Amino acid sequence: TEDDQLIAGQSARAIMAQLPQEQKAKIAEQVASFQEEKSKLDAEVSKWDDSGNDIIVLAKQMCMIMMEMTDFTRGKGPLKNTSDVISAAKKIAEAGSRMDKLGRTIADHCPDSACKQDLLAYLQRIALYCHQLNICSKVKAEVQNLGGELVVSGVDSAMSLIQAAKNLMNAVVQTVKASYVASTKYPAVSWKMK
Amino acid sequence: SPEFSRTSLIAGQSARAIMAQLPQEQKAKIAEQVASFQEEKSKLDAEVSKWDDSGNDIIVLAKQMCMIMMEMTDFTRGKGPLKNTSDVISAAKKIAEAGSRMDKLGRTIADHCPDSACKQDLLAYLQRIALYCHQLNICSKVKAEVQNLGGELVVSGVDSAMSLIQAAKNLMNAVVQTVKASYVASTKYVSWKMK
Ligand SMILES: [Br-]
Ligand SMILES: [Br-]
Ligand SMILES: [Br-]
Ligand SMILES: [Br-]
Ligand SMILES: [Br-]
């Protein structure tokens, strides 16, 4: 069942590690773009103490699984086969579903309409990009006929996966910010500065 | 480009699908090997045509091995029922178990043969059955390879395919020689009924 999922006879991560430099460089540019969004999330969560704030806890744990996926597109990290990437997406979607519950509780107890709506829209983005990560995690690198050779291309699947993670990262940042704001207009979530 | 299909369900390109689109330079070397395999398989067709399969489990087993072996050579061309590497491996396993059963029956025929030369000839061919079954098992596990060349990661299935086919060709030749020799060693005193 491991050899069910090989591409051209090798593990998915091994294929990413052997992609031609041009593909690897296009992937690296997306990864660097991803690290900018991770920078915004690190700066936001570092404002808050994670005791009694599972939103912050879940944000950090979603971010750390996305880094495993980001590493996978470079042929590194713990995710070896497609099934591992799928399962990592699944964990992220679970954490997002838990973040969405907490966030909706905060929203319902908020009577500031514009703050309510902003929070709820960011929680839709969490759902959207958790789904997108699930979808993108099932797209394997592909084999293409080019000039009488069979060549491996994984750049498109890697970049779509990274792009979904970038967007999810941004949705988490907005959700953290908007959850704190909505709370100050009211709690299972304590917003203690660090 | 190789056909996408549902794999274990998400889209993927299976080993059989990859064989099916190998560059025609790779496919030409494989066809050459399959042609010489076909020659050996003819010789089995002629030999087992000459006999009735009732009570002759030697001949029953020989057509069983031939049919699975054709599934394997078809795989190297992107055809037949073996889709995944694990299918090629399990096909080699069932060939090996058939060969085990053929070896068993063969060795009892040999041990009841009073012509010493004919006994030894039969036993020699049975040794080839056992060696070539093991060797087909080995070759069934060889995967395609990828190599960074030309600024591309390029796929090649030539070497696993040719190795699989040469293994099946050796075993095919051993099986037909084993039938011819099982009968000869039977003449010297499993039913060898024609038609
Ligand atoms: Br390169
Ligand atoms: Br490219
Ligand atoms: Br609340
Ligand atoms: Br297929
Ligand atoms: Br054939």
Numbering used by the authors:
A (entry chain A): 658 to 843, 855 to 862
B (entry chain B): 648 to 655, 663 to 843, 857 to 862
What does the literature reporting this entry say, word for word?
The cadherin-catenin cell adhesion complex is the major building block of AJs, and has a crucial function in the dynamic behaviors of epithelial cells, such as cell polarization and cell rearrangements. The structure of α-catenin (100 kDa) consists of three distinct domains. The direct interaction between α-catenin and F-actin was demonstrated to be a catch bond, an interaction that is stabilized by increased force.
The electron density map of α5-helix clearly shows that V796 adopts a conformation that exposes its side chain on the ABD surface, along with two additional hydrophobic residues L785 and I792. Our observations of the cryptic (attenuated) and exposed (activated) conformations of V796, despite the nearly identical primary sequences of αEcat- and αNcat-ABDs (87% identity), indicate that this residue resides within a conformationally dynamic region. Consistent with this idea, the αEcat-ABD-WT structure contains an internal cavity that could accommodate V796 in the cryptic state similar to V796N in the αNcat-ABD-WT structure. Our site-directed mutagenesis and actin cosedimentation assays with the αEcat-ABD variants support critical roles of these hydrophobic residues in F-actin-binding: Ala substitutions of L785, I792 and V796, individually or together as 3A, led to a range of reduction (75, 36, 47, and 78%, respectively) in the amount of ABD cosedimenting with F-actin compared to αEcat-ABD-WT. The equally significant reduction observed with either the L785A mutation alone or 3A suggests that L785 plays a central role in establishing the critical hydrophobic interface between F-actin and αcat-ABD. The measurable reduction in F-actin binding with I792A or V796A suggests that I792 and V796 are likely involved in further stabilizing this interface, and any changes to these residues could modulate the F-actin-binding activity of αcat-ABD. These results confirm that the hydrophobic residues on the α5-helix surface constitute an important binding surface for F-actin interaction.
